[PDB]
Scaffold this active site. Structure first.
Site, PDB file in Angstrom:
ATOM      1  N   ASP A 175      -5.302 -13.458   0.935  1.00  0.00           N
ATOM      2  CA  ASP A 175      -5.670 -12.224   1.227  1.00  0.00           C
ATOM      3  C   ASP A 175      -7.149 -12.327   1.257  1.00  0.00           C
ATOM      4  O   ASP A 175      -8.121 -11.290   1.172  1.00  0.00           O
ATOM      5  CB  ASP A 175      -5.531 -11.059   0.104  1.00  0.00           C
ATOM      6  CG  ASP A 175      -5.600  -9.777   0.425  1.00  0.00           C
ATOM      7  OD1 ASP A 175      -5.821  -9.451   1.905  1.00  0.00           O
ATOM      8  OD2 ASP A 175      -5.531  -8.759  -0.122  1.00  0.00           O
ATOM      9  N   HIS A 178       0.753  -1.265   0.016  1.00  0.00           N
ATOM     10  CA  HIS A 178       0.010   0.078   0.034  1.00  0.00           C
ATOM     11  C   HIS A 178       0.823   1.209   0.083  1.00  0.00           C
ATOM     12  O   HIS A 178       0.482   1.996   0.831  1.00  0.00           O
ATOM     13  CB  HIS A 178      -0.997  -0.012   1.403  1.00  0.00           C
ATOM     14  CG  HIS A 178      -1.865  -1.028   0.907  1.00  0.00           C
ATOM     15  ND1 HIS A 178      -3.145  -1.058   0.319  1.00  0.00           N
ATOM     16  CD2 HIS A 178      -1.937  -2.321   1.563  1.00  0.00           C
ATOM     17  CE1 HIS A 178      -3.699  -2.376   0.454  1.00  0.00           C
ATOM     18  NE2 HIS A 178      -3.092  -2.910   1.210  1.00  0.00           N
ATOM     19  N   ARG A 203      10.343   4.557 -17.458  1.00  0.00           N
ATOM     20  CA  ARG A 203      11.454   5.764 -16.730  1.00  0.00           C
ATOM     21  C   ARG A 203      11.302   5.467 -15.152  1.00  0.00           C
ATOM     22  O   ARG A 203      12.123   6.179 -14.607  1.00  0.00           O
ATOM     23  CB  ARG A 203      11.292   7.311 -17.159  1.00  0.00           C
ATOM     24  CG  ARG A 203      12.162   7.368 -18.264  1.00  0.00           C
ATOM     25  CD  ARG A 203      11.476   8.584 -19.094  1.00  0.00           C
ATOM     26  NE  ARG A 203      10.990   7.982 -20.384  1.00  0.00           N
ATOM     27  CZ  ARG A 203       9.686   7.961 -20.738  1.00  0.00           C
ATOM     28  NH1 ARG A 203       9.044   8.940 -20.283  1.00  0.00           N
ATOM     29  NH2 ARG A 203       9.643   7.605 -21.872  1.00  0.00           N
ATOM     30  N   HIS A 211       1.009  -8.588  -1.438  1.00  0.00           N
ATOM     31  CA  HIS A 211       0.123  -8.696  -2.680  1.00  0.00           C
ATOM     32  C   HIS A 211       0.521  -8.056  -3.938  1.00  0.00           C
ATOM     33  O   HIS A 211       0.091  -6.929  -4.382  1.00  0.00           O
ATOM     34  CB  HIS A 211      -1.371  -8.725  -2.555  1.00  0.00           C
ATOM     35  CG  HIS A 211      -1.729  -7.424  -1.806  1.00  0.00           C
ATOM     36  ND1 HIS A 211      -1.354  -6.276  -2.141  1.00  0.00           N
ATOM     37  CD2 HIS A 211      -2.766  -7.285  -0.905  1.00  0.00           C
ATOM     38  CE1 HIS A 211      -1.839  -5.287  -1.452  1.00  0.00           C
ATOM     39  NE2 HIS A 211      -2.719  -5.898  -0.512  1.00  0.00           N
ATOM     40  N   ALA A 259      -2.106  -2.302  -4.988  1.00  0.00           N
ATOM     41  CA  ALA A 259      -1.705  -1.080  -4.119  1.00  0.00           C
ATOM     42  C   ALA A 259      -0.263  -0.783  -3.993  1.00  0.00           C
ATOM     43  O   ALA A 259       0.214  -0.789  -2.981  1.00  0.00           O
ATOM     44  CB  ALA A 259      -2.489  -1.186  -2.822  1.00  0.00           C
ATOM     45  N   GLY A 300     -12.365  -7.520  -2.894  1.00  0.00           N
ATOM     46  CA  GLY A 300     -11.664  -8.311  -2.028  1.00  0.00           C
ATOM     47  C   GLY A 300     -11.562  -9.582  -2.548  1.00  0.00           C
ATOM     48  O   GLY A 300     -11.952  -9.804  -3.816  1.00  0.00           O
TER      49      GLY A 300
HETATM   50  O1  LIG Z   1       5.668   6.071 -24.067  1.00  0.00           O
HETATM   51  P1  LIG Z   1       7.066   6.950 -23.341  1.00  0.00           P
HETATM   52  O2  LIG Z   1       7.537   5.757 -22.205  1.00  0.00           O
HETATM   53  O3  LIG Z   1       6.602   8.252 -22.779  1.00  0.00           O
HETATM   54  O4  LIG Z   1       8.141   7.365 -24.397  1.00  0.00           O
HETATM   55  C1  LIG Z   1       7.799   7.379 -25.706  1.00  0.00           C
HETATM   56  C2  LIG Z   1       9.241   7.362 -26.693  1.00  0.00           C
HETATM   57  O5  LIG Z   1       9.051   6.738 -27.918  1.00  0.00           O
HETATM   58  C3  LIG Z   1       9.368   7.927 -28.805  1.00  0.00           C
HETATM   59  O6  LIG Z   1      11.068   7.709 -29.345  1.00  0.00           O
HETATM   60  C4  LIG Z   1       8.983   7.603 -30.188  1.00  0.00           C
HETATM   61  O7  LIG Z   1       8.431   9.048 -30.603  1.00  0.00           O
HETATM   62  C5  LIG Z   1       9.461   8.910 -28.026  1.00  0.00           C
HETATM   63  O8  LIG Z   1       7.857   9.393 -28.026  1.00  0.00           O
HETATM   64  C6  LIG Z   1       9.735   8.684 -26.515  1.00  0.00           C
HETATM   65  O9  LIG Z   1      11.077   8.503 -26.612  1.00  0.00           O
HETATM   66 NI    NI Z   2      -4.423  -5.056   1.150  1.00  0.00          NI
END
Ligand SMILES: O=P(O)(O)OC[C@H]1O[C@@](O)(CO)[C@@H](O)[C@@H]1O
Ligand code: NI
Ligand code: NI
Lengths: 379, 379
Positions: B271, B193, B225, B214, B218, B306
């Site tokens: 759970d 959570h 990235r 789990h 959550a 649940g």
């Molecule tokens: O989907 P994300 O993680 O936002 O990134 C998209 C990536 O693909 C691309 O290279 C293609 O245009 C850019 O939009 C970016 O680098």
């Molecule tokens: Ni929970």
């Protein structure tokens, strides 16, 4: 004459070799043999202890060293790109044309045809990335040209498969038959810029898709109840996946995880654009301004618009940041890309019979020279 | 008196045995031996070709067989659960109290003490899921009670480690020192959570978290990235992850992927709530009423509300939909959970000198009986 590359560590793809040499004959590798086995008469290029591997193969490259393929659709552009590639150990590549008009697609086909009629094993064919994407995962792709795949252009593509290695498309809302025809014509089909669920992506693998364009970027992620396109890629062993290791596109921890799952199906691409190997503030990407900003390539909104990565850097970041062994990193930048496009019988390894496309690089990952069709050219 | 379990397939956790028997002496497994090696005058229980395995250890159970633990915080409730558990092969568990008041936590501590004082290796300790969560991923937990961790309740929790097996918290905005203190008292700390970044999650494993609650539910998921919590669990060898295999909480393809990544560290958990192993068509829980529709739990909106999963069903789902092998799935319900809370010395394995908690089930995954501290009782 024949000659021998000597005094180096050799990464053949299967073995890391010390005190051996590589004998080149014409465009080909004659032999990898111990240094004591080398004929007395033989000419020698001495590599001062550096690394020798097959040349890098870049499956997604939009432009570089100052130029863009979409913007100057000509053999001479492809040519310029090829030479900049050499500075960063890249000996082969698919010139990549993103979402644009039919006319641009016919121009690129001609340009590829032109370049490849003159030089072999350098450009290995077009990569058409777009235009048959999903508007919701468009990234930098042009809202004006993203369209459904149509029978006419699909037939044109099939007919020109001798100059076309790869098509990235989004399969959710496009005809499955178009995948089959492309695959049937020997073009590799890749999922990308797609809003597909896990199920739809699985369906399109069954239809012939064998590649995924820049894993994690412009694709449905893995969530608890929807594995999405990412999950499908993780759950389908036949599918290769390209991944960009600039440190900006994908967190290194994710590359590491992806490799443990994907192993030899994970491929290093650059997705590089004009600033890779060139100093510039911005470039044009099909009537879009894309800015260079502290190592990234971004539009007005901060959407990433390709990279400024080179193949040598992708190998290095993979060793140093991802934690992958050097011999394996090289394989992801050479042998695995070659297997994925069906050229591995001639490129991607250092072995007898195959084409002499090689890269030499020092311990700090500086590319000191390449061999291209047997021709040795220093940096 | 001694007796032998017989004419079964035995899943010890290390081996799958045909034509063998297990000897029970009092509350211990005496030996596992060929049937031919049985003293001729020993009492045998012919199990009719059923599967024999260690009893299932459920590490997350909020209530079942009609009652919720947060509703009636008594040694009496724990016992209603145990008796219902036995119907679906679960012979040990963690009575799980969700986020509430200090006063309720004190009652929970007391109810577990009293129960464990009377019976051993059934309740293996209290699990506190909350209250030190992140409001941003609260799910069904009360906003009024989700609060930072505080020295006083942390000091009391530690002071009662003998009866508390586990605590789930969100580490990103609570004191690290608190995790240390809990682990030092021999309490397992689980991330749950939470809205933690990968970096935060990794910091928490460093401070002593060895479990994740789990997986996929959550928590912060894995995007390009931002590896998140899901990413941190994938990238850390030490951390076990519990997972709910009901087919509703997590897609089965995601469980398959996670097993490949995590192996020995992936634990099956229910759970479960009240409806599990009971006939109900709804239950009220801390205000909101949740309907029991054909084996699913939903609020009047049809949204997941649940779990009604039992361990024997978890195992069947894992074999049948995830694609994992029977012995491995059994391990995920027995040995792995046992190791995660540090009870493997006595439980989760059919082996000389270990406690005789066993489950017998047929080919159709119908539980036929169990054995608890040596006592055979048919279903
Ligand atoms: O989907 P994300 O993680 O936002 O990134 C998209 C990536 O693909 C691309 O290279 C293609 O245009 C850019 O939009 C970016 O680098
Ligand atoms: Ni929970
Ligand atoms: Ni792209």
């Amino acid at each position: 004459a024949m000659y021998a590359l000597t005094n180096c560590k050799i990464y053949t793809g299967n073995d890391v070799l010390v005190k051996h040499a590589v004998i080149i004959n014409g465009d080909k590798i004659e032999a990898v043999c111990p240094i004591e086995s080398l004929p007395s008469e033989m000419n020698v290029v001495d590599l001062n202890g550096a690394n020798l591997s097959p040349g890098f193969i870049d499956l997604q490259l939009n432009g570089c060293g100052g130029v863009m393929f979409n913007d100057e659709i000509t053999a001479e552009t492809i040519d310029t790109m090829h030479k900049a590639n050499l500075k960063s150990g890249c000996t082969s590549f698919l010139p990549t044309l993103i979402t644009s008009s039919d006319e641009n697609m016919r121009q690129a086909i001609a340009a590829a045809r032109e370049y490849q009629a003159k030089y072999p094993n350098q450009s290995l064919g077009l990569h058409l990335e777009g235009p048959y994407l999903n508007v919701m995962k468009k990234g930098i792709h042009s809202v004006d040209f993203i369209r459904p795949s149509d029978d006419t252009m699909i037939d044109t593509i099939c007919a020109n498969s001798d100059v076309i290695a790869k098509v990235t498309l989004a399969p959710e809302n496009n005809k499955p038959e178009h995948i089959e025809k492309l695959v049937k014509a020997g073009i590799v089909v890749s999922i990308g810029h797609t809003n597909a669920t896990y199920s739809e992506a699985r369906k399109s693998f069954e239809s012939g898709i064998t590649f995924a364009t820049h894993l994690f970027n412009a694709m449905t992620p893995m969530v608890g109840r929807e594995p999405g396109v990412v999950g499908a890629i993780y759950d389908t062993p036949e599918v290769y996946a390209g991944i960009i290791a600039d440190g900006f596109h994908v967190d290194y921890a994710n590359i590491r995880i992806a490799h443990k799952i994907k192993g030899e199906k994970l491929v290093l691409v650059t997705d590089a654009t004009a600033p890779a190997g060139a100093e510039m503030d911005y470039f044009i990407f099909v009537g879009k301004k894309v800015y260079y900003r502290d190592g990234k390539c971004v539009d007005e909104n901060g959407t990433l618009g390709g990279s400024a990565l080179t193949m040598i850097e992708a190998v290095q970041n993979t060793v140093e940041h991802v934690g992958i062994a050097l011999d394996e990193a090289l394989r992801m930048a050479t042998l695995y890309p070659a297997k994925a496009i069906g050229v591995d019988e001639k490129l991607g390894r250092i072995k007898k019979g195959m084409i002499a496309n090689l890269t030499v690089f020092d311990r700090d990952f500086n590319v000191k020279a390449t061999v291209v069709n047997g021709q040795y050219e220093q940096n």
